[model samples]
Target: MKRTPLFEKHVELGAKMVDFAGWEMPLYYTSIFEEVMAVRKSVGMFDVSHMGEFLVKGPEAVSFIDFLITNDFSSLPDGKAIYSVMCNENGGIIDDLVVYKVSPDEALMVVNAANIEKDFNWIKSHSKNFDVEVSNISDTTALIAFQGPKAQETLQELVEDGLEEIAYYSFRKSIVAGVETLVSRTGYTGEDGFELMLEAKNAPKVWDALMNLLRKIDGRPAGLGARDVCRLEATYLLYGQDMDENTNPFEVGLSWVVKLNKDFVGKEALLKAKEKVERKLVALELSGKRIARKGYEVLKNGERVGEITSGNFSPTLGKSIALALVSKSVKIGDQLGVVFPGGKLVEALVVKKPFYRGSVRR
Candidate 1:
């Protein structure tokens, strides 16, 4: 399996290794519960270098990016980033991404690891009218995320030069722990965190040093498993599960990210599809410990209304929580039942997204 720069560190820390998207990644360090709690209560870190990066630059960069993503990039000022999704002609998601406006002629696109090649080709094929250069830099950089309530404190103490000034979705370059790194107030764990990007060769040094600092601070090393749980608890959408090529933004609770004034690839179809959406994504808090899983049947009065897209035991909520795509007719607070283990039933409610309020709020 392909390994990251922190692969050896993961093994040395007695991590449970598993194959994820063609890479050998850490499933957990020692305790999933402890690590999850560390991130919630104090500070923790993750190795997310597997996430892909693409650099697009040229005179037509703005227009080309504007045509591709659902968010407005035309007027985005320099050094700003916005979350967006690339949709097909049918208003279905090709991939969800972050568009970072580096300059008037340059933009950096951070995409999901699994969709790297596909997203690159899609962007390349769609940049016909615009003169833009796209560079895939996934293999050359490393990303380390330090997150929790004390994330700013941890980074500030370690860096000596304060990193408390970087706002959300904004980044600044600084030598942290004596390593030149780009620290961004960005994360997938729904916590206050900084994602550091640096040279691939130097990744292990910073990763190890950070872990050592975390040890001094009594912090934790969270893995993808815990990261998934954290993100789900915050109602952050999982790419392939919550919404994919077959799901629309409004139907999947991301209508706020879809701008109507912007002329994008799927605008016409999305506008036309506005009235025909039969189901909407909603969060559910179960009545019991009988866990519900993805693809589990969502029944209204014993009739199957929809399917669960993402579900698990929320470490924060102390209960089974999930994001499900249910019939639009199902209103909030409506009664629902999910068939549980061994033909048993678990009750639930159609509530809002984010089953747990995490440490993301400062």
Candidate 2:
């Protein structure tokens, strides 16, 4: 299995490693719950270098990216980034990724680690007609996700200035801790944070500098186990779990990212898909102690309405929370049941997503 640049650092910090996709990644450090609390209460860092990067450049960069994604980023400025869903011809989500507009003629595409190969092939296949050059830059790059409430305060120590200048969904080419990097003010935890994309060789020093400073503030080096919970609590979608080829963007509540006005690869099907929505991804709060694992059948009056896409014990909310794809007939505040193994039916209530947010509510 491939290891990130900071693999040895994880080992030294006593991480419990596991096979995530094909990468040997740290599952957690002290425990999943503690790491969860670390980010919620203070600050936390994650080595997300295993994620993929693609360099898309040429005169058609703007036209090329707009053709590939659901969102319209043609008006985006050079320093900003936007998140969008890449869909197949049938309006099914291929992957959810971030595109950073380096310039009108160049862009950086950040993809999920699991979909690296598939996304590369898909993007490459569509490049034949456009005046674009898309190259896989995954192996040469490394990413560090520094998150939590104290993110700005803690990270400000490294750079000379400009940490406060970057806004949400924005990035700039800067040197952090003496290492050249793309400093992005983006995060999945629904908190003010930053993601540093730098050369693979420079990751170790940046990791060392961040962790050394974070330790003084009682921050932690979190892992995927904690990452999964934080994202779920923040109500972010997991590609394979929450959606796949069979589920369209509208079905998964991703219509906000899909622009029907502009012409794109999946525009035709999504235009048809907008009016044909059946299942919707909804948030639920379970009354039981057990988590609603993926594929667990969700029932409405003993009939299968849908299944749990993602679920976890929310440390912030002190409750079991989940996001399930169920019939549109299911409304907010409706009582539902998740059929666990051995036919144990667990009752749940349809609640608003974003179970926790550091900025909005504590």
Candidate 3:
């Protein structure tokens, strides 16, 4: 199995590694709850180098990207990034991605690890008049995220300039901890954090430098297990879970990321879908400690209403929470039941997305 640049570091720390999307990634080192609290109170780092990075450039870049994604990139300026979802011809979601406009005809797209190949082929087959050339840079790229309440303070100590200069969703290339890297104010955790991209060869050195600095702040290493809980608390949908080709964006509460005003692939189907969307993504707070695993049936008034897409024992919420796909009839605060193994049923209440966020003052 493939491994990220931080594989050695994870091993050095005695992290329990497991296969994730064909990559040998760290599952966790200590208790997930301990690391979760550390990330909330202080800071934590993760090796997300297995994610996909693609560069679409050339004179036709704008046209090519516009034709592929739901949003129009023609108006996007350099250094600005926008969250977008790609769709198939029938308006079903292909993948949700972040697109960064580097120039008038060049942009960088960050795709999910498992969907890298599919996303690449989708964009390549649709490139038309644009001088667009999509290059997969996954093997040559690496990503690391420094997250938590104290992330900025911890990061500033190692950077040339103040961390406050890096605004949310924006990025800049500079020497961080004496190593040149691209700093993007993006993250999966609800806390304020930055995602750093570095050269494949320099990843190990950079990862070590950041971890060493975070040590003084009492930071810890977070693995994919913790990453899932953190993101679920923020209602950030996992690509394959909360959405897929079998799901529509409107049904997944990702309509905000879809731009219907622009002419793009699947626009008509998605627009029509909006007119008659029968179901929507719903957040559920479990009444007990039991997790409503994926594919668990959601029932209302003794009738099946939907299915749980992703469920977890939310560390931040102190309760079991889930993101479910249910019929629009389920209103906020509506009580429901989810079937568990052995015919067990867990009570749940419809709640809002993003179960937690850091303090505004912090």
Which lDDT values do the candidates have, in the order given? 0.84, 0.91, 0.85
lDDT order of candidates, top first: 2, 3, 1
Model 3 segments more than 4 A misplaced: 359-362
* Model 2 Cα lDDT, one tens digit per residue, 1-362: 99999999999999999999899999999999999888888888999999999999899999899999999989889998998999999898899999999999999999999999999999999999999999999998999999898888899889766788888898888889998889989988877789999999999999999989988999999999999999999899988999887888899888999889898887899988898898899999999789999999999888889999998998888899999999999999999999999999999999876677774211
Better of 2 and 3 by lDDT: 2
Instruction: Output the worst ten-in-a-row residue range by lDDT, candidate 1.
Output: 353-362
Q: Each model's TM-score, in the order given?
A: 0.95, 0.98, 0.97
Worst 10 residues of 3 by lDDT: 353-362
Error of 2 at 238 (Å): 0.6
lDDT of 1 at 100: 81
Badly placed stretches (over 4 Å) of model 2 are: 360-362
Please give the TM-score that candidate 3 achieves against the real structure. Answer: 0.97
Taking the tens digit of each residue's C-alpha lDDT, what string does model 1 give over 1-362?
88888899899999999888788999899877888888998888999888888889899888889999998899888767788888999999999988888788988888887888899999888877889888888888888889888888877865745676777887767897788887778888888888888888889888777877788778999888888888888789988888899998888878888888979999999998787888899889898766688888889999888988988778788988888888888888988988765667789987765677666744
Candidate 3, number of clashes: 2
Best by TM-score: 2
